């Protein structure tokens, strides 16, 4: 197989430093300009890093003089080793083999900021006092109170008819909530959503009535 | 720098018709060596990029023949033949031909459908939280078409404006719809103090406000 693999990344305060890497199979860093990118919340990629395969290192005014790249040649590794980080490097990080096809890890996540790690409160939004409890309906999950933003909502894990919408801040914390539908006559089956947040190591799981 | 230019969004197309999105450099991506160093990935909600295209003319790993890319060394147009719902999401247009690497700021495909009135389904706020004192309550306006919609919360009559969160999904990679949630947020004291909300869609299909209340 072929793939990368990216790790090192988590919270970290204002002007801290953590260093990331960045392993593989099938590819042999040695052999090429292997480099660091980072993606924010605008959505749009960030050079952050280059190292030949002489060794040449290269890197965007963003970030020089406190990042530096580094390649192990025997053991086969990548590295990103940050210094005096900003609340503007937080972003998830990749590592990746641009030249010809290029291949990319599925990234790690760095934080910046002095804020603490929050488990998440995860509420049941299901029908109470007349409703339209009948075919098709419509059961839901409220998280909030977390931090960071990382949390994934999982139903039964045979969800199709899932929506899960897109966290927001509020107050420094961050809140979202996931929606499922069903015919009603499987409502009386157990439907449960299962909140993991690894950013606090939970996992809540809520059965709705 | 090679500057990557793409339009942020592309017409809606019709499902199993084409579709295409342009890009073009500043710099000609053709190399010596008779290789076009253009790739274009793909970034869906809630996935990581996925590579369709590299070298400008070469289909990545697992990505079907209805993705093709053709053009100059500086004006190229990516070909989706058959559009499929799943297909909705982020094209970015991209140079592998030197540092520094840039990127293209993306194109949203947009899908074209027929139109679609929103299930709303409303939620009060739940035991579990209003034993901690907090108390929010929940409406989601699920399935919708176009994405342009506007909700309305009623207090015991009155426009509750303040205090409310709304959060939209992308296109549904299935259905081609859209999605939303509303979220009044406020004190359990302040929601004691109240009975009957409302949570009213406005949308631009019909003209019979889609309300739910409690
Ligand atoms: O020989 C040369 O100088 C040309 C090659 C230069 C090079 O490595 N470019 C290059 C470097 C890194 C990338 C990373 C792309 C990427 C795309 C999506 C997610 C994560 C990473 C893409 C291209």
């Known amino acids: 197989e072929v793939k990368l693999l990216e790790s090192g990344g988590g919270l970290v305060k204002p002007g801290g430093s953590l260093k990331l890497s960045c392993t593989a199979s099938?590819?042999?860093?040695?052999?090429?300009?292997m480099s660091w990118v980072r993606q924010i919340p605008e959505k749009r990629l960030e050079w952050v890093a280059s190292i030949s395969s002489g060794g040449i290192t290269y890197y965007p005014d963003s970030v020089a003089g406190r990042f530096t790249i580094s390649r192990d040649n025997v053991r086969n590794i990548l590295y990103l080793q940050m210094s005096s980080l900003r609340s503007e490097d937080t972003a998830l990080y990749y590592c990746?083999?641009?030249?010809?096809?290029?291949?990319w890890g599925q990234g790690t996540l760095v934080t910046v900021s002095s804020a603490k790690t929050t488990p998440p409160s995860v509420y049941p939004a299901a029908p109470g006092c007349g409703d339209t409890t009948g075919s098709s309906v419509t059961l839901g999950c409220l998280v909030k109170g977390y931090f960071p933003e990382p949390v994934t909502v999982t139903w039964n894990s045979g969800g199709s008819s899932v929506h899960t919408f897109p966290a927001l801040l509020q107050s420094g914390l961050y809140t979202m909530s996931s929606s499922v539908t069903v015919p009603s006559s499987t409502w009386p089956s157990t439907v449960t959503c299962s909140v993991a947040h690894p950013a606090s190591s939970t996992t809540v799981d809520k059965k709705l009535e | 720098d090679i500057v990557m230019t793409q339009a942020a969004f592309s017409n809606p197309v019709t499902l199993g018709t084409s579709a295409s999105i342009s890009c073009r450099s500043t710099?000609?991506?053709?190399?010596?060596?008779?290789?076009?160093?253009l790739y274009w990935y793909l970034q869906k909600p809630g996935q990581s990029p996925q590579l369709l295209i590299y070298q400008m003319s070469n289909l990545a790993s697992g990505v079907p023949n209805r993705f093709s890319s053709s053009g100059s060394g500086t004006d190229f147009t990516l070909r989706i033949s058959r559009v499929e719902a799943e297909d909705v999401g982020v094209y970015y247009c991209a140079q592998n031909l030197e540092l520094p690497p840039t990127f293209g700021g993306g194109t949203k495909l947009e899908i074209k459908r027929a139109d679609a009135a929103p299930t709303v389904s409303i939620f009060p706020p739940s035991s579990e939280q209003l034993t901690s004192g907090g108390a929010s309550v929940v409406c989601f306006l699920n399935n919708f078409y176009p994405k342009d919609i506007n909700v309305k919360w009623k207090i015991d009559g009155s426009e509750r404006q303040n205090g409310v969160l709304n959060s939209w999904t992308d296109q549904d990679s299935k259905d081609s719809t859209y999605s939303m949630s509303s979220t009044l947020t406020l004190t359990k004291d302040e929601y004691e103090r109240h009975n009957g909300y409302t949570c009213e869609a406005t949308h631009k299909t019909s003209t019979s406000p889609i309300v739910k209340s409690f």
């Open positions: 990746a083999r641009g030249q010809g096809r290029p291949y």
């Open positions: 710099k000609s991506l053709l190399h010596s060596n008779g290789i076009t160093y």
């Open positions: 099938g590819i042999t860093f040695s052999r090429y300009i």
